Amino acid sequence: NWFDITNWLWYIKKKK
Amino acid sequence: QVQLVQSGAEVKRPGSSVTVSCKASGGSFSTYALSWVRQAPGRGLEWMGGVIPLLTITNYAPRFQGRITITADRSTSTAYLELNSLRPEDTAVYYCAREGTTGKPIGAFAHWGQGTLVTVSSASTKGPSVFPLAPGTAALGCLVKDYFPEPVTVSWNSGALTSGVHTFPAVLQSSGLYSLSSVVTVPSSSLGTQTYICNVNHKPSNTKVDKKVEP
Amino acid sequence: EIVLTQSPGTQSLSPGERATLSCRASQSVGNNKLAWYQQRPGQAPRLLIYGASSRPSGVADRFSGSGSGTDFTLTISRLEPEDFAVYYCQQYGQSLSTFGQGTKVEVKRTVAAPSVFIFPPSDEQLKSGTASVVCLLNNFYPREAKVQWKVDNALQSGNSQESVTEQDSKDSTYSLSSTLTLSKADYEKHKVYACEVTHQGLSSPVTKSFNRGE
Numbered sequence: 001n002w003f004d005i006t007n008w009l010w011y012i013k014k015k016k
Numbered sequence: 017q018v019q020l021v022q023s024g025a026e027v028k029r030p031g032s033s034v035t036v037s038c039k040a041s042g043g044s045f046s047t048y049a050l051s052w053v054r055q056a057p058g059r060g061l062e063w064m065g066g067v068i069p070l071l072t073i074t075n076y077a078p079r080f081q082g083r084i085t086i087t088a089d090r091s092t093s094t095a096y097l098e099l100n101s102l103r104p105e106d107t108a109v110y111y112c113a114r115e116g117t118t119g120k121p122i123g124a125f126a127h128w129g130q131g132t133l134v135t136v137s138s139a140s141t142k143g144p145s146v147f148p149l150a151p152g153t154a155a156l157g158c159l160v161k162d163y164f165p166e167p168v169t170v171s172w173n174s175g176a177l178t179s180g181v182h183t184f185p186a187v188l189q190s191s192g193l194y195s196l197s198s199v200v201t202v203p204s205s206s207l208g209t210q211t212y213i214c215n216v217n218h219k220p221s222n223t224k225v226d227k228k229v230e231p
Numbered sequence: 232e233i234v235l236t237q238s239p240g241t242q243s244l245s246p247g248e249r250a251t252l253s254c255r256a257s258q259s260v261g262n263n264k265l266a267w268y269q270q271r272p273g274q275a276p277r278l279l280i281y282g283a284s285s286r287p288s289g290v291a292d293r294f295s296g297s298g299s300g301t302d303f304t305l306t307i308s309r310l311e312p313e314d315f316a317v318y319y320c321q322q323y324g325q326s327l328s329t330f331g332q333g334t335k336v337e338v339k340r341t342v343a344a345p346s347v348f349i350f351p352p353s354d355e356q357l358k359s360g361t362a363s364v365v366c367l368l369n370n371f372y373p374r375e376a377k378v379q380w381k382v383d384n385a386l387q388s389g390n391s392q393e394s395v396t397e398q399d400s401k402d403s404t405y406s407l408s409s410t411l412t413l414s415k416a417d418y419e420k421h422k423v424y425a426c427e428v429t430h431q432g433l434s435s436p437v438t439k440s441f442n443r444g445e
Contacts, residue, residue, distance in 0.1 A: 001261060002075040002326040006049050006121040007067055013047070051328075053276075061268075061276060061319055063328045075326050078232075111275055116287060123323045124266035124281035131275055147353040147363070155348040155367055159410070160354075182369070182399075182406045187392040189412075195392070197408045199367055201346075 017045040020112050020129035021029060027165050033100040036132045038112035042107065043127075045093040046070040049115045051125060052086060052097045054108040075109045078162040102136045109133050133163035139164040143221030148229040149199065151207055156229050157199030158214035162191070163221065171215045207231055233257055235320050235331035243339040243373070250307040252334050254320035261324030267296055267305045268319045272397050276319065280305060315398070337374075340402040344432030345371035345407075347383070348408075349425075349439040352418065356401045362418035364411040366439065367425035370404040377429040378409045381438075382421045389409060418443070 024036040028167035038045040038050065064074035069088035076084050085098040095112060116126025137183040142164045149157035160168055170183050198214060216225045232396040234257040244250055254265065268276040278287055280296035283303060293308045307314055315338050345368035352362040368376055374395065380387040393409040409426065409427040425440035 001050065001264075001324060002066070002068075003123045003264065003323040004048060004075070004262075005071070005073065006115065007123075008118055009047050009068075010068070015396065050286075053330075059346070060333045061270075062323075063330060066347075069237065078328060116278060116281070122281050122285075123264055124321070125268075126277055126278045126287060127274075128275035143358075145356070145359070147356045148367055149350040149367075150353070153346070155346075155369060157350070157358075157365075157367070159365060165352050173233040176290050184396055184406075187410075189392065195410065196394070197365060197367075199287045199369070199408065200404070201369060202249050225329065230390060 018114060018127045020114060020127055022110075022112060022129040022132045025135070026135040026141075028135060029100050029138055030102060030104065030136055032102050032136075033098060034102060034134050036097045036099075036110050036134065037111075038095045038097075038129050040093045040114065043114075043117075045088075046090055046199045048121055049123070050086075050088065050095045050111060051113045051115075051124070053113055054110045055131075056105065056108040064097070064099075068093070072217070079139055099134075102134075104136050107134065107136045130143070133166065135165050135193050137164070141220050142193060143218050143223030144168065144181070144195075144216065144225075146216050146225045146227045148227060149197065151202075151231050152204045153201050154207060155199055155201050156212055157228055158216065158229060159195070159197050160216050160218075161195045162189070162193040162213060163195075163218050163223070164193050165220060166194060168194075168196060168216060168218045168219075170196075172178065172198070172200055173211070173213055174215060177212070232327055233260065233322050233325060233329055235322060235329055237318075237320060237331035237334045239334065240332060241337055243333045243337050244310055245339050246310055246312060248310050250310055250314070250336055252305040252307075252318055252336075254298075254303040254305070254331050256301045256303070256322060260303075260322045263299050264322060264324035265296075265298070265303050265356065266321045266323065267294075268321065270319065271315045275403045278376045307336075310415050337398055338405040340372050341351065342432045343370060343404055345369060345373045345376060345428055345430050345437070347428050347437050349441060351424070351441055351443070357415055357418075360372075360415045362413050362415055364424050364427075366409045368407040368409075368413075368428055368430075370399075370406060371430055371432060372404050373431060374398075374405045376405075376407055377430065378407065379427045380411045381408070381423075381427060382411075
């Protein structure tokens with residue numbers, strides 16, 4: 001789902 | 017607060033291509049999803065596609081795939097919609113819409129631009145003629161005929177008369193020109209004494225007419 | 232493609248009443264990614280609910296979303312005047328996002344038959360070679376109404392257009408105007424111009440007419 005991509009981006013950007 | 021500001025209304029000839037722009041301010045541009053949604057006259061919302069700027073990843077509705085390009089420029093925080101091979105059924109208000117956040121993105125569209133009316137037509141700019149609809153209760157009005165493009169605004173008595181006023185949605189004639197009417201109901205007894213003037217404004221043609229409607 | 236069905240497309244309700252709006256999906260919506268929007272005439276849509284049940288800050292808590300899978304509902308616990316508007320559902324649980332066709336929540340009021348008025352062409356317009364005849368159906372409810380033009384008793388087709396106002400914010404009625412257009416030469420071949428109106432509030436059709444030239 002393309003609509004879930006930015007949530008993934010937000011999580012990976014928060015983590016590291 | 018995130019604000020999206022779109023480019024202005026455009027008239028486009030059939031077969032041409034249109035570019036609509038959407039400039040964002042107030043948030044992070046690169047990592048949030050920006051979509052385009054259109055609404056044809058009297059119809060519902062239709063999702064066209066979107067872009068995630070950081071990744072240059074587009075996602076188009078199959079209906080539009082092959083006829084649409086969505087791009088994003090981080091240097092100006094602007095997204096663009098191109099729609100090609102335009103036909104009359106592409107006449108619509110086009111909105112850009114950005115997902116909301118809780119921050120964490122939510123997918124659904126919290127932030128909307130003001131809309132851009134794209135009119136696909138071979139018509140030329142033209143100011144309307146304003147004709148009277150001459151008058152218990154009496155009805156009277158003005159017929160604002162043969163103009164292009166939208167919109168026209170109408171007031172009565174320089175805005176002093178609003179009670180009982182009905183200004184109808186424009187209709188698109190076979191000529192490609194629009195027409196609309198505006199009416200008001202008033203006491204019959206008032207017709208001899210009170211003046212009724214319709215003020216019609218069509219900015220694209222600089223037609224500003226104040227028509228006195230009499231029995 | 233997921234098809235979202237909002238039925239009925241209009242609900243006529245009273246101020247203060249509870250409203251429940253349905254959205255049914257043709258297949259299960261992934262992760263309950265279902266949003267609701269409100270739209271008023273002349274305005275962009277506004278997000279009310281996302282993720283089936285979550286409400287953005289700023290959105291009134293009289294709006295609530297529920298449901299899962301294929302069956303979603305927007306509930307408005309008590310209709311305020313500003314809640315009479317169009318509502319859309321949207322799913323974004325697959326890359327191809329889709330909207331429902333919308334449901335208009337309109338104000339229910341007592342039946343009102345139209346007041347009908349006919350207007351001959353102005354002398355100004357006739358001087359230019361064209362004749363538009365206008366029929367007005369004023370202040371009626373419900374919205375469904377029909378107008379037919381007859382010219383010397385002949386039913387017209389293809390030479391008229393009509394439009395309807397938004398529901399009036401003060402008396403909750405609608406109005407409709409229809410315009411018949413002919414060349415001046417064709418207008419002058421006929422005598423009686425009539426419009427015939429049908430509506431729930433009328434027990435039989437109402438005709439308004441004039442004779443050209445009187």
